Amino acid sequence: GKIILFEDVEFGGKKLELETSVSDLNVHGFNDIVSSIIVESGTWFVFDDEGFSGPSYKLTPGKYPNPGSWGGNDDELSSVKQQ
Ligand SMILES: [Ca+2]
Ligand SMILES: [Ca+2]
Numbered sequence: 001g002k003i004i005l006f007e008d009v010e011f012g013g014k015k016l017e018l019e020t021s022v023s024d025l026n027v028h029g030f031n032d033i034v035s036s037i038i039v040e041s042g043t044w045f046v047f048d049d050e051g052f053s054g055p056s057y058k059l060t061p062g063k064y065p066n067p068g069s070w071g072g073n074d075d076e077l078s079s080v081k082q083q
Contacts, residue, residue: 001042001082003059009035009066021081024050034077037064043083048076058083 005025007013016030025031037046039061048054057070067074 001044002040003042003044003046003080004038004040005030005034005077005080006036006038007033011036011038011063011065018080021052021079023052023079025078025080026050031078032075034067035074036066037070038062039064045081045083046070046072046077047079047081048073050078052079052081054078 005016044059
């Protein structure tokens with residue numbers, strides 16, 4: 001699986017590419033800043049709390065240009081897990 005997290009909407013700003021689960025996005029300086037997402041491959045769950053907990057959102061391959069596109073809130077993702 002490969003997911004790319006973006007600081008700004010419409011795939012702008014700083015980006016973080018991940019191929020493994022991350023229980024705490026702070027380790028990569030990406031806690032509570034994500035505003036768009038591209039899933040290149042795999043199914044991913046993204047969570048608003050650390051540790052694969054809090055509000056969760058399922059994402060399959062494709063582009064998600066704003067948090068509404070995954071049903072979520074801006075600047076709230078804290079952990080991500082591969083399905
Ligand atoms: Ca942001
Ligand atoms: Ca959060």
